[PDB]
Design an enzyme around this catalytic site. Structure first.
Site, PDB file in Angstrom:
ATOM      1  CB  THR A   1      15.132  23.838 -36.858  1.00  0.00           C
ATOM      2  OG1 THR A   1      15.942  25.318 -36.487  1.00  0.00           O
ATOM      3  CG2 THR A   1      14.888  23.055 -35.249  1.00  0.00           C
TER       4      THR A   1
ATOM      5  CG  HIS B   1       6.254  24.748 -35.051  1.00  0.00           C
ATOM      6  ND1 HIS B   1       6.353  25.870 -34.694  1.00  0.00           N
ATOM      7  CD2 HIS B   1       7.667  24.761 -34.659  1.00  0.00           C
ATOM      8  CE1 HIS B   1       7.376  26.376 -33.991  1.00  0.00           C
ATOM      9  NE2 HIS B   1       7.902  25.544 -33.933  1.00  0.00           N
TER      10      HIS B   1
ATOM     11  CG  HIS C   1       7.716  28.224 -38.012  1.00  0.00           C
ATOM     12  ND1 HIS C   1       8.289  26.538 -38.129  1.00  0.00           N
ATOM     13  CD2 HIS C   1       8.068  28.369 -36.688  1.00  0.00           C
ATOM     14  CE1 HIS C   1       8.975  26.200 -37.279  1.00  0.00           C
ATOM     15  NE2 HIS C   1       9.420  27.317 -36.672  1.00  0.00           N
TER      16      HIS C   1
ATOM     17  CE  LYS D   1      16.211  29.595 -30.943  1.00  0.00           C
ATOM     18  NZ  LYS D   1      17.201  28.766 -31.695  1.00  0.00           N
TER      19      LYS D   1
ATOM     20  NE  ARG E   1      18.121  24.915 -29.611  1.00  0.00           N
ATOM     21  CZ  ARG E   1      16.829  25.545 -29.738  1.00  0.00           C
ATOM     22  NH1 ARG E   1      17.516  25.696 -27.703  1.00  0.00           N
ATOM     23  NH2 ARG E   1      15.809  25.496 -29.602  1.00  0.00           N
TER      24      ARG E   1
ATOM     25  CD  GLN F   1      16.913  37.789 -38.689  1.00  0.00           C
ATOM     26  OE1 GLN F   1      17.335  36.209 -38.195  1.00  0.00           O
ATOM     27  NE2 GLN F   1      16.596  37.934 -38.569  1.00  0.00           N
TER      28      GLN F   1
ATOM     29  CG  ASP G   1      12.073  35.421 -31.982  1.00  0.00           C
ATOM     30  OD1 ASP G   1      10.822  35.626 -31.850  1.00  0.00           O
ATOM     31  OD2 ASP G   1      12.533  33.860 -32.187  1.00  0.00           O
TER      32      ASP G   1
ATOM     33  CE  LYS H   1       2.281  22.961 -22.786  1.00  0.00           C
ATOM     34  NZ  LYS H   1       3.622  22.741 -21.921  1.00  0.00           N
TER      35      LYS H   1
ATOM     36  CE  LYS I   1       7.642  19.993 -25.886  1.00  0.00           C
ATOM     37  NZ  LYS I   1       8.467  20.781 -25.235  1.00  0.00           N
ATOM     38  CB  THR I   2       0.184  18.636 -27.515  1.00  0.00           C
ATOM     39  OG1 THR I   2       1.210  17.489 -29.109  1.00  0.00           O
ATOM     40  CG2 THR I   2      -0.860  19.789 -28.786  1.00  0.00           C
TER      41      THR I   2
END
Ligand SMILES: Nc1ncnc2c1ncn2[C@@H]1O[C@H](COS(=O)(=O)NC(=O)[C@@H](N)Cc2ccc(O)cc2)[C@@H](O)[C@H]1O
Ligand SMILES: Nc1ncnc2c1ncn2[C@@H]1O[C@H](COS(=O)(=O)NC(=O)[C@@H](N)Cc2ccc(O)cc2)[C@@H](O)[C@H]1O
Lengths: 318, 318
Positions: free
Chosen positions: A39, A44, A47, A81, A85, A175, A196, A231, A234-235
Site C-alpha cells: 500500500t 508501519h 505491521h 475499509k 480504494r 488471499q 480484520d 489511532k 499515525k501521529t
C-alpha cells in the site's frame, strides 16, 4: 503451550480451532504465513505486530513464511475499509513490493536450516493466471450469498450510499487461494494476521479443505490501539514507518518514549521479547517506585534496536 | 423503419433507446452482434429466432456479427436460470464450438460485400487474459451492489433454496466486455438477443460507454413460446436440434406440420421470411376456406428449407 503463551501477552484475538491447532503445534514444527500488501513503500508500526509474531513462532521452532502481496496489491483488500480504494500502477507496486521484502528480511532468521524463513510473493502465481482458469477452478468454490454476509465487507454492500467494486469483492478469493497454494507447496498449515484479516483467512481454510482436503488453521492477533482509543502508527506527521528514511531512528525512539502509562506495558508485551514475567516485574517496579516510570525507556530501547539495530539506537541518542 | 417492421411481427421485446436506435439505423448501415454459447454440440429452435433476426438486419443492409462463446461457455451464463449450470471440460467445449460455428455459417451471408457476416469467438480475448488484468481493467467498473439486484440473478440470491457461485456471478462482466471489445474492433453498436439476455446487454452498453464513451444500443427479441403454454422446441425426444443427425429433416418437418393453429401464424412471422402481408392473407384465407389450414404446410416448407436446404426438404418427404 505456545498459543497460551501468546494469550498471556494479549496477542490472540481469535483462533479457528485452538485445540487441534495447539495439539498440532505440539506434534512438531510447522510452517505458517503472514501477508502484507504493497500500500506504501514501507510498512508501519501496525505491521510490526504480526511480523514480530512470525518471529515469535519461529523461535518456538516453527518456520515462518513472510508473503508480500505482489498480486493482491494490484487489487486492494476492502476488509473493514469504509471506502473503495484506488488502484496503484503496476510499476509503483513493484517498487514498493521490493522495498518491503528487503524491509521484512532483517526481522527473521533466514538461515538455521530446519526453520529458516521463506519470502513469498503471490504475483508468482496470480501473475500469469488466465482469468477463465481463475474463475472456473477457484470461483466455483465461492458462494456470493455468503461472500456477501462476511463481516469484512457486509456493510459496504448494505448501504444506498456506500458500495464496492467487483474487483475488491474478489480480493477474498485470491488471499483464500494463497493459503491453499502455500499449503500445497510449503506445508503451511497456519495463517496469522490482525483481526480484520479473519474473514480472509476463513475463506482460506475453507478453500484449502475443498481443494486438498487438509485441515488448515487460522489465528489472529488483535489490532493494537492506543489506550486512549485514538489511532496508532499515525501521529501529527503521519505513520511511523519502519523505513529510517521515512521516520528517523531519533524520531522513532522519541515516539516510544512518549507512550502513555496505560499503554507502555501492553506495548512491551506486543513489541518486545521480554518474558511476560519481567514485563510485569517492570510494571510493579514502576508502580511502587517514587521515581519516574522506566518502562518507556525500556520500550524505546528494545524496539528501536529491533527495528534499527545498535546503529539506530546509537543514532536515536544524538 | 426496421425497428417497427420487426415489431409488426412481434420480434421485439425491448430496446435501449428506440428513438435513437431508430435514428442511428437510418443514418446508415451498422455492425450488430448476437452471441451463442456452446452448451451442446448443436443449437436448437430457440436459438434460431435471434439468429434469424441477424439475417433480417443483414437483409436490411447491416453487418451481422455471429459470436460463439468459446470462453463464456466455460463460465456458464446464470441468466434467469434456477440452478448452477455445471462446468464442461475445456476439451468438450472447444469441440462443441466448432460445431456451432459451422452450423451457424449457412444462415448468414458471408460475402454479399460490405455487410458480409463476421464469425466471432470471445475465447480470442479471454483465453489469454491475465486474471489481475481482468479484475482491475474491467472489474473496477462493476458495482456488486447493482450486480446483486439485476433481475437475471436477483433470483439466485435473495433465496434460501437457491444460490450462485462466484463463477457464474462473473459471467455478466464477460459478456459486458464482449460488447466493448466488439465495439472497439468492429464498431458494433447493437447487441440483439433473447429477452433473458437483456441485463447482460445493458451491462455491455454501460461498459462500452464507461470504457470508450460511445452510445451503444441493445434490442431483445421475445422468448418465443407455444401459445398453449408448454416449452418451445421440446418434444418426446426433447429439443429439436438444427443438426440433421440429432433431428432428421423428416422429424424436423413433422414437428412443423404438427404446429397448433394458435401458433402457426406467429411462427410464420418468427421463423420465416414471408412478408407480413402474405402471412396475414394466409391467416385470412385459412379462416374462411372449408379446407384444412395450409399455413402448417407453408411453415414447414419454409423453415425446413431454411434449416436444411432443398435436400433436407425433399428428404422430409420420403
Ligand atoms: N495496528 C495493527 N495492529 C495489529 N496488526 C495490524 C495492525 N495494522 C495492520 N495489522 C496487520 O498486519 C498486516 C498489515 O498488512 S495489510 O496491508 O493490512 N495486509 C492485508 O491487507 C492482507 N490482505 C495482505 C495479504 C495477506 C495474505 C495473503 O495471502 C495475501 C495478502 C495485516 O495482517 C493486518 O491485519
Ligand atoms: N426460445 C427462444 N426464443 C427466442 N430466443 C431465444 C430462445 N432461446 C434462446 N434464445 C436466445 O438466443 C440465444 C441462445 O443462446 S444462449 O446460449 O442462450 N446465449 C447465451 O447464453 C449468451 N450468454 C451468449 C453470449 C452473448 C453475447 C456475448 O458477448 C457472449 C455470449 C440467446 O440470445 C437467447 O436469449
Amino acid at each position: 503451550n505456545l498459543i497460551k503463551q501468546l494469550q498471556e501477552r494479549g496477542l490472540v484475538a481469535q483462533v479457528t480451532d485452538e485445540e487441534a491447532l495447539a495439539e498440532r503445534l505440539a506434534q512438531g514444527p510447522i510452517a505458517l504465513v503472514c501477508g502484507f500488501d504493497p500500500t506504501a513503500d514501507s510498512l508501519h508500526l501496525g505491521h510490526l505486530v504480526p511480523l514480530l509474531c512470525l518471529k515469535r513462532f519461529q523461535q518456538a521452532g516453527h518456520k515462518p513464511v513472510a508473503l508480500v502481496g505482489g498480486a493482491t496489491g494490484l487489487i486492494g483488500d476492502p476488509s473493514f475499509k469504509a471506502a473503495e480504494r484506488k488502484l496503484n500502477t503496476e510499476e509503483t507496486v513493484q517498487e514498493w513490493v521490493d522495498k518491503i521484502r528487503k524491509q521484512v528480511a532483517p526481522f527473521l532468521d533466514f538461515d538455521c536450516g530446519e526453520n529458516s524463513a521463506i519470502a513469498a510473493n503471490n504475483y508468482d502465481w496470480f501473475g500469469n493466471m488466465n482469468v477463465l482458469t481463475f474463475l472456473r477452478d477457484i470461483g466455483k468454490h465461492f458462494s456470493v450469498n455468503q461472500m456477501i454476509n462476511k463481516e469484512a465487507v457486509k456493510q459496504r454492500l448494505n448501504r444506498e450510499d456506500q458500495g464496492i467494486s467487483f474487483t475488491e469483492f474478489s480480493y477474498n478469493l485470491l488471499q483464500g487461494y494463497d493459503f491453499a497454494c502455500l499449503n500445497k507447496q510449503y506445508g503451511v498449515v497456519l495463517c496469522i494476521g490482525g483481526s480484520d484479516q479473519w474473514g480472509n483467512i476463513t475463506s482460506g481454510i475453507d478453500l484449502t479443505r475443498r481443494l486438498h482436503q487438509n485441515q488448515v488453521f487460522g489465528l489472529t492477533v488483535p489490532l493494537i490501539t492506543k489506550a486512549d482509543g485514538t489511532k496508532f502508527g499515525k501521529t501529527e506527521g503521519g505513520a511511523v514507518w519502519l523505513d529510517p528514511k521515512k521516520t528517523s531512528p531519533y524520531k522513532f525512539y522519541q515516539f516510544w518514549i512518549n507512550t502513555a502509562d496505560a499503554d507502555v506495558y501492553r506495548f512491551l508485551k506486543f513489541f518486545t521479547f521480554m518474558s511476560i514475567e519481567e514485563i510485569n516485574a517492570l510494571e510493579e517496579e514502576d508502580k511502587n517506585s517514587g521515581k519516574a516510570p522506566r518502562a518507556q525507556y525500556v520500550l524505546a530501547e528494545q524496539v528501536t534496536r529491533l527495528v534499527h539495530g545498535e546503529e539506530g539506537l546509537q543514532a536515536a541518542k544524538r
